[PDB]
Amino acid sequence: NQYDNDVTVWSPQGRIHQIEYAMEAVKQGSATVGLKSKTHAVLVALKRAQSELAAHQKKILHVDNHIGISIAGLTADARLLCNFMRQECLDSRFVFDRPLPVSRLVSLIGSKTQIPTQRYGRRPYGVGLLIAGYDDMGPHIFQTCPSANYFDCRAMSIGARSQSARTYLERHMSEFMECNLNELVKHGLRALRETLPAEQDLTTKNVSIGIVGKDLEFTIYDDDDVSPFLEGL
Amino acid sequence: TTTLAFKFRHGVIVAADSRATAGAYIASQTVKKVIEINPYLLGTMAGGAADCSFWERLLARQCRIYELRNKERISVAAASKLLANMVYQYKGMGLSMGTMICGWDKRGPGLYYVDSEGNRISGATFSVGSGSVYAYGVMDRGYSYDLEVEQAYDLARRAIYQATYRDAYSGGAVNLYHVREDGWIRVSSDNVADLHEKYS
């Protein structure tokens, strides 16, 4: 019980326990799904409220006109990362007058998130991200971890009870490329529904959707704005 | 420009013109040269338009913070000292700013003159601007601590009007303010052209 108190301490098995715990934080978070087609990248998140009289915590944030994120973990760390991403996107537009490519933005995140995991007194970022964006290379979906590692995905889910969602995405992965925007969103909602604990249904109060496309700047749908998508499932 | 303020029995009267020039060109004739720092505090602007507007606004923010922290309105002396200290850091760097701080504090009506050159003094009557010399003559001859409210309004309007008549860089409308125990009130805004007809 002496190798799990610092991030600069390797364990005998060649594992850093502090990083493992940070990965365990995002697991306690709430579920969120992200998928892409030939034209669009979609983020659907399940928001939960601490109390019945409290508003559901927001999970999808703006980064730029072509990039958005879904968070799962420590919100304070999420805002710190979101702030960093926005500045990087702004700097690219200011210097090159051009949107920052999604992959290059993700690489910057990994570099920033890696530094804390190697210095004494620092801690990993306790937040996972699902980055959805559109660039000259087409739609993109990325996944980030408290360990400074990222994966270019075609459909991913993170958060509590997200394995049931990942099971659905793998089963129907073959259809996402050639489906329309309405069909693609419904696929994201159906997966999120699987994560839900049986006696509970998707509602306009707990579902938030984020869409980015070829000719569609990143937009967030919440509250009654989600009703058109839910109608049909 | 011509700004003017004096203390009398029923508070302090503040008056100014509304002209801003860029060299010999009349940039505007509707400039508000009196800043409502607080419902009980006023500030006048003379010199650089940008310098005056920025530093008065900075003073207004500082005064508001002071009230929130201390749960009591800042005094006129403290507000003028705040402005004097803020602008003294940039002494000799080219700031042009001549201000009068007018209000009603716990000690009573107050009138302080603060200049970017570092001057900070209090007095019964003050006049700042290019036309200040002209407004001093009219104000000095007609001023009395026992003036009636209506008389004080007329003296302030006349002093500004005469200054606009003799000073090329002063003109527009005469904005008049009156600070009382329960706060300041916007008395009137009379155009110089209309005043010229009334006085002649």
């Binding site: 200011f94 051009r98 490519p101 690489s107 000259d136 | -």
Partner: protein
Amino acid sequence: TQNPMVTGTSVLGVKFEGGVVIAADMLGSYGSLARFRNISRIMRVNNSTMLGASGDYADFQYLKQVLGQMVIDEELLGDGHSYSPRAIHSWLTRAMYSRRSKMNPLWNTMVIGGYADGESFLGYVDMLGVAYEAPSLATGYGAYLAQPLLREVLEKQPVLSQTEARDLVERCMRVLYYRDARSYNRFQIATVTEKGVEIEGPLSTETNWDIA
């Protein structure tokens, strides 16, 4: 650079149907002295961008080193994204403006030509951060001598062919040699099209009538 030492003269540029062409002589003048007569003042920024520069040559070499390094770094990623002529033009404007603001300017006037997405680009950047895009450009004395000829033709005919643009550039280069005291007879022509960037060898203004 507070005071330039070795400087290049005017640089020309004009865009045609499907590309852009830039010209500049190979001469570094050390204040009324044709000191270095075989220096190329045109650079291949990348596969779809080329850059000519006037003013201090050392500052031009510095920008060559910096800009060349960035292009290398972008190619290392291999993610399918490459700097466009507009992106390079934007980067140069910021670099020039920032140096001017710090009061340590890069004493240069640069012309950026490129061709991407089936669209031609031609941009200008001064040492003070002034930038814009025009159908034709001419820095230095080219603004007084060569620009009137290019503008007159382009107003008559908005769209030119590659051959017409090349002939127009050669005529302007001839005029500059006649009337510019800091010009040289050997010059280069760089062209960017869908096939990339090609730089022509040390051409000479052979057509030089001297009927006195």
